[PDB]
Amino acid sequence: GLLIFFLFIGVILFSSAVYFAEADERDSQFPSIPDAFWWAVVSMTTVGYGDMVPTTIGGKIVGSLCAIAGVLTIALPVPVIVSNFN
Amino acid sequence: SERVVINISGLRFETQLKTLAQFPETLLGDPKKRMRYFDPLRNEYFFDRNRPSFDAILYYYQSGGRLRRPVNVPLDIFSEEIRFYELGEEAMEMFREDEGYIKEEERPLPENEFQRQVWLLFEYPESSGPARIIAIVSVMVILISIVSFCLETLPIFRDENEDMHGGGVTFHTYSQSTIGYQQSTSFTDPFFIVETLCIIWFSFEFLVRFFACPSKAGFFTNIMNIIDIVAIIPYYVTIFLTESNKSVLQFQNVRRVVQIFRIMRILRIFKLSRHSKGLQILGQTLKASMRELGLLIFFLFIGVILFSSAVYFAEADERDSQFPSIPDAFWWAVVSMTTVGYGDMVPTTIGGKIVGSLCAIAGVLTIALPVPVIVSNFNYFYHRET
Amino acid sequence: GLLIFFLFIGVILFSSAVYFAEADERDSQFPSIPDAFWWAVVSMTTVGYGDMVPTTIGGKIVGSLCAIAGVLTIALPVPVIVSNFN
Incomplete structure (x- = not known):
């Protein structure tokens, strides 16, 4: 649950930031914050399909952080789970 | 008391x-x-x-x-x-x-002067300076056999033929495209030369080792010997097959088998395991990790089917569905769980994306569970040597 | 070096297999084994750009294994490095 919760926090923070950073663009791939959730989860889990990608400098900065925060976010709770399994 | x-x-x-x-x-x-x-x-x-x-x-x-x-x-x-x-x-x-x-094995050449002496420069690179020279050649031949096998697929060489511009289809150009080279006693094709040379040497080692080893019984027990054999089988089997089907129709009928053995040639890569301590450790690791390796595959299998099914139905009532069937979605599920995410298949509906999200997370956890054990085994075998 | 070596072995095995599995296809994205190296490294490191993807069933089976083998391949030597750093 802690994993889901942290992921949830990150999804909302980055979806929000990428939305606004791409807002003043005619070719924005982010219609709304809720729509950007998909992009945020796809980036944090580092799956990166590429169906949604930021195009502005601010969007890419947000994107960069999103990827790194993802690795750390997931990395924190898993170890414990792996231990239990072990 | x-x-x-x-x-x-x-x-x-x-x-x-x-x-x-x-x-x-x-x-x-x-x-x-x-x-x-x-x-x-x-x-x-x-x-x-x-x-x-x-x-x-x-x-x-x-x-x-x-x-x-x-x-x-x-x-x-x-x-x-x-x-x-x-x-x-x-x-x-x-x-x-x-x-x-615990563990101590390895007989020793009895036919002294001859066998025992040869079996030392074809089994122990440190036995002498000449022994090393041989081992070095083996690596050269192996690397060369690999580089050559790969270049056979380069368009610059294979697309330069008699049927290159969609004209007719010649029997000789057809078998050369399937096998990878031209099997002719005239040794005209440069690839058949290199391949033949390499196999001459691979055949040599295998022969020597066989008619110069202590126990010629526990020979096909050593995984290394199996590799040596598998490294030449393709060559001779291809010869046999083509000579037994020297006509277009006949070849066309045995082409699949020929193709299979061409792919098998790549296994020659493992011939390097006789000169690689790391590659041997990996072998011991995998051997010791069958239970976890299978557990990984099994869990992955469970996840693939669950998510493929869910994403299929979530995208089903859509005209532009990228998921024709559950089996087709397996690809998407594996690509997402391993987090490779090519993006050639992606859900477009809200339900599909929710399923997709979970799929990615479940993937990380699924893979993360069995690996650690494997990594441990490797670490053990690796240090209990270094 | 062990990492590079193992990766090298995997690259050649999977590039070869995916090449042949996609060979008898008009729309093959794999011109040769050497060209497929790129796809193999991109899959094993799990980067997956998607500029090269198998389209046949045999290619996808090869691809699946390639991804899994990648995770394991990289996972083996890193731990030691991480320890040294630590």
């Missing part, structure tokens, strides 16, 4: 004589052997030795055979004490096993 006092560098131990009499052939169990250490003034046997170790030595007699090394005592120091107290080879063997050891 008479009691015995053993003084280990000041540390006082006490036991019954019957407890020691249990193992007569040891130092403490044999009166004639311990006599030397008796102090008649204090009525005790005195040993100017390591203290932490004796606890376990005494417990060995009390337990009736349990020889456990104390956690706080170095294996090198404890082993010396086991030998000093003369506990015997059986106990020692039992001990090293538990401590994670």
Whole structure:
């Protein structure tokens, strides 16, 4: 649950930031914050399909952080789970 | 029931004589052997030795055979004490096993002058300078056989033929496209030359090793020998097959088999495992990790089917669905769980994306569970060598 | 070096397999084995750009294994490195 919760926090923070950073663009791939959730989860889990990608400098900065925060976010709770399994 | 006092560098131990009499052939169990250490003034046997170790030595007699090394005592120091107290080879063997050891094999060339001498420069790179030279050539031939196998697929070479511009289709150009080279006694094709040379050498080693090894029975037991054999089978089998089907129609009928053996050629890559310590460790690791490796595949399998199914139905009522069926979605599920995410298949509906999100997370967890164990095994085998 | 070596072995095995599995296809994205190296490294490191993807069933089976083998391949030597750093 802690994993889901942290992921949830990150999804909302980055979806929000990428939305606004791409807002003043005619070719924005982010219609709304809720729509950007998909992009945020796809980036944090580092799956990166590429169906949604930021195009502005601010969007890419947000994107960069999103990827790194993802690795750390997931990395924190898993170890414990792996231990239990072990 | 008479009691015995053993003084280990000041540390006082006490036991019954019957407890020691249990193992007569040891130092403490044999009166004639311990006599030397008796102090008649204090009525005790005195040993100017390591203290932490004796606890376990005494417990060995009390337990009736349990020889456990104390956690706080170095294996090198404890082993010396086991030998000093003369506990015997059986106990020692039992001990090293538990401590994670044991293993000694490898006969030796009997036909001295000839065999034994050859089997040293074709099995032990350190036997002599010439031995090294040989091993080095093997790597050169292997690497070359690999580079050549790959270049056979380069368009610059294969697209330069008689049927290159979609014209007609010649039997000779057809089999050359399937096999990868031109099988002709005229050795015109440069790829057939290199391939033939390489196989001449691979055949050579295999032959030598066979007619120059101690036990020619436990030969096809060694995984290394299997590799050597598998590394040449394709060549000869291709020859046999093409000569047994020298006509267009016949070849067309045996092409699949020929193609399969062409793919098999790549296994020659593993011939390097005879010159790679790391590659051997990996082999030992995987061998020791079948249960977890299968567990990984199994869990992945479960996840693939669950998510493929869910994403299929979530995208089903859509005109632009990228998921034709559940089986087709397996690809998407594996690509997402391993987090590779090519993006050639992606859900477009809200339900599909929710399923997708979970799929990615479940993937990370799924893979993360069994790997650690595998990594441990590798780490063990890796260090228990370096 | 062990990492590079193992990766090298995997790259060649999977590039070869995916090449042949996609060979008898008009729309093959794999011109040759050497060209497929790129796809193999991109899959094993799990980067997956998607500029090269198998389209046949045999290619996808090869691809699946390639991804899994990648995770394991990289996972083996890193731990030691991480320890040294630590």
